């Protein structure tokens, strides 16, 4: 099972941010709201000149709210692809947090929010070209990615756009877009690779599925490069599974590269 | 756009998880008000052989209990069986008790599991109730007492508490009133589950999620009536569809009636031929109609 860490600390920070025709989500920490800067675009379907929109920005046209609280915007600045709004009230439920970027193959959690309303939570995996495969629709931009590591809450992702190939692109909380994509409605291209993760077969045989009977093969056919997986409990070497990688019956009709080895173990053997 | 198994947010349920231990057994309990609900097999002296719960209740001492949230203790002042559940009154009211109700989850319905190890919530994920009262979670040692919850129209329902894993890997739990789902016993037995029956309502919804995500190779120039599908379902381990009314919205947006998807089910039950539908190699009944609608269109 793909799992997500609990969302209790992140839920009270989600606000509804609207400007013009655009309604999305924002991250309310302290007296600041971080949101995707394309919320102030007069037309998100056509190319945006972000310096023109910031030149014509009228702070009184914002609508930032959480439940029955209306958060008046006192100031607005860009930071990368993110918009940072200073609001007239501190969030009394701001949790202890740090910021952090996610590398390819890693896993984190997505709190999907719909026009300011948290609705779902699920775990993701940072893909090849800096994308993730989640399930975002209209109104979910500003959805927050987070990871909790040893009593530390890390905000690691804010949603921005979906590519033409259905993959999802976002930034970190400091404004750098993962994968280097731009926040324009022009077409962009994800790369053509699969993960250490395809750990998926190691869990496929602990559950009873054993229908098992390489970096050279993996470098020229879109697979990441790779045995220290040791815990030996199922009795099958990894090159006895690297053979299965070399692609009408797996817990799934294709190879699954979404679970890190640490997760799948910390889920089968726990602790 | 994508389809993923979702879980509703867990903020209201987290402050109610506590660590409960008696002797060598440690699990989790649900702290609501001044009461903590946990599985009654925590006072059993040996959980690997048949347990006489009458004797274990006769020899329980309240001071041997260890109830705590975030390593601060709660004093147990009363222990009592309610069904397969232990109901413990504690010396402190939970100040974060959310408004809630209790209810039982029916077969085919979806809910959320907050997996907890030793009183600390570890992860959250959505699940679906199988026909024989079981679910396919990822419970390991120390996760009993993990709480199943669902929220409907801003009403928080507690619906599940974990107890045991069957021999076949299925996971068995109780509602919050001590009634074990499926009628299984809270014993270290070799009880068997039975024949799993796929939810037809859920399989149709999963195929609508495929169509919405651009996958339509399974739809052909054929459609089968409702009763004809219901007759086929009686003998192929599929539940009967009472109507096509819960799919009026999905059929309008995709342009594919349910009867066309009904024919695709009878055909795809044979097999996928290696083709995968939204990362799935066989028919999947984990997603409910409203679950699909909320993920695809918000609502
Ligand atoms: C943000 N709330 C929304 C989320 C989308 C909706 C479908 N799935 C998603 O992830 N996205 C947008 O508002 C952006 C806006 C631009 C200016 C970044 N739109 C898109 O991502 C766009 N793709 S693009 C930029 O042309 O590659 C869509 C709307 C055509 C998918
Ligand atoms: C409780 N924390 C634990 C959860 C298990 C551990 C493995 N997966 C789970 O879901 N449950 C138990 O230890 C129970 C206790 C008895 C009194 C019901 N026993 C089992 O789940 C048992 N299965 S059984 C029905 O006895 O064959 C195991 C321990 C063999 C899995």
């Amino acid at each position: 099972r793909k799992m997500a860490q609990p969302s209790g600390l992140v839920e009270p920070c989600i606000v509804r941010v609207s400007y013009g025709n655009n309604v999305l989500n924002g991250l309310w920490l302290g007296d600041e709201v971080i949101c995707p800067r394309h919320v102030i675009a007069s037309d998100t379907t056509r190319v945006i000149n972000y310096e023109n929109e910031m030149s014509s920005v009228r702070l009184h046209n914002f609508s930032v709210s959480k439940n029955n609280v209306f958060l008046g915007v006192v100031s607005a600045k860009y930071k990368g692809v993110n918009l940072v709004l200073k609001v007239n009230q501190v969030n009394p439920n701001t949790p202890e947090h740090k910021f952090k970027s996610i590398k390819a193959g890693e896993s984190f959690n997505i709190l999907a929010c719909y026009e300011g309303c948290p609705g779902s939570v699920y775990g993701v995996n940072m893909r090849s070209q800096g994308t993730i495969k989640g399930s975002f629709i209209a109104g979910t931009c500003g959805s927050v990615g987070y990871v909790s590591e040893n009593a530390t809450l890390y905000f690691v992702y804010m949603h921005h756009l979906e590519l033409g190939n259905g993959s999802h692109v976002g930034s970190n909380l400091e404004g750098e877009m993962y994968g280097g994509y731009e926040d324009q409605p022009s077409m962009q291209l994800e790369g053509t690779v699969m993960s250490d993760n395809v750990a998926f077969l190691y869990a496929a045989l602990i559950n009873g599925e054993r229908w098992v009977t390489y970096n050279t093969w993996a470098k020229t056919n879109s697979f990441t490069e790779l045995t220290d997986f040791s815990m030996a409990k199922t009795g099958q070497s990894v090159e006895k599974l690297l053979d299965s990688i070399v692609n009408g019956r797996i817990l799934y009709g294709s190879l699954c590269d979404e679970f890190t080895p640490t997760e799948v173990i910390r889920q089968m053997y726990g602790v």
Side-chain angles (χ1 to χ4, degrees), chain A residues 97-114:
Chain A
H97 64 280
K98 277 144 150 40
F99 292 153
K100 172 205 260 217
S101 324
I102 296 266
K103 345 283 183 58
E106 290 193 331
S107 266
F108 61 103
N109 322 284
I110 284 297
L111 176 65
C113 310
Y114 303 78

Side-chain angles (χ1 to χ4, degrees), chain A residues 22-25 36 38 41 43-46 48 50 135-142 157 159-164 166-169 177 182-188:
Chain A
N22 308 323
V23 191
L24 41 71
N25 305 285
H38 76 243
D43 192 2
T44 57
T45 83
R46 312 183 164 275
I48 306 153
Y50 279 109
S135 150
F136 299 86
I137 45 152
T140 69
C141 285
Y157 182 94
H159 186 60
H160 274 265
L161 62 106
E162 170 181 333
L163 296 173
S167 308
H168 299 104
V169 183
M177 200 77 96
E182 287 229 57
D183 45 351
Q184 298 281 347
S186 70
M187 201 189 52
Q188 291 154 100

Side-chain angles (χ1 to χ4, degrees), chain A residues 26-128 130-149 151-191 193-200 203-206 208 211-215 217-224 226-227 232 235-236 238-239 242-244 246-247:
Chain A
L27 186 61
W28 183 23
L29 307 164
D31 68 336
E32 283 188 308
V33 170
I34 315 179
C35 83
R37 84 177 159 160
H38 76 243
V39 70
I40 68 174
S42 58
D43 192 2
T44 57
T45 83
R46 312 183 164 275
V47 188
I48 306 153
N49 180 289
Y50 279 109
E51 318 80 32
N52 289 358
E53 318 276 2
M54 181 59 88
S55 297
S56 64
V57 76
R58 294 320 150 152
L59 297 187
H60 66 95
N61 280 331
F62 276 113
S63 206
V64 185
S65 61
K66 167 63 140 198
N67 296 314
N68 286 288
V69 178
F70 187 64
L71 295 174
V73 173
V74 316
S75 174
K77 303 112 185 207
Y78 292 146
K79 178 155 111 136
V81 303
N82 282 344
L83 193 53
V84 181
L85 314 178
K86 289 261 180 188
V87 288
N88 59 2
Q89 185 182 330
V90 153
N91 187 5
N93 300 288
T94 305
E96 274 174 30
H97 64 280
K98 277 144 150 40
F99 292 153
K100 172 205 260 217
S101 324
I102 296 266
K103 345 283 183 58
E106 290 193 331
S107 266
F108 61 103
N109 322 284
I110 284 297
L111 176 65
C113 310
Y114 303 78
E115 289 107 6
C117 185
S120 307
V121 62
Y122 59 106
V124 291
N125 204 273
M126 178 72 84
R127 284 221 302 196
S128 193
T131 65
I132 62 176
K133 269 264 179 185
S135 150
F136 299 86
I137 45 152
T140 69
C141 285
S143 285
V144 161
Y146 64 97
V147 76
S148 206
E149 284 170 26
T152 318
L153 172 58
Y154 295 107
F155 292 120
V156 303
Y157 182 94
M158 169 158 297
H159 186 60
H160 274 265
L161 62 106
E162 170 181 333
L163 296 173
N165 74 328
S167 308
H168 299 104
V169 183
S171 72
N172 52 18
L173 267 304
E174 278 117 331
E176 321 167 21
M177 200 77 96
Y178 291 116
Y181 302 88
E182 287 229 57
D183 45 351
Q184 298 281 347
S186 70
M187 201 189 52
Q188 291 154 100
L189 278 164
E190 204 189 353
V193 317
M194 291 262 289
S195 173
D196 310 75
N197 290 355
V198 171
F200 159 70
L205 70 93
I206 307 184
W211 73 266
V212 296
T213 66
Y214 286 86
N215 186 198
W217 170 79
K219 287 272 206 278
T220 88
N221 224 296
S222 313
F223 264 80
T224 62
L226 200 176
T227 316
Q236 270 267 27
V238 316
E239 38 266 20
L242 286 139
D243 183 72
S244 322
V246 56
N247 213 9

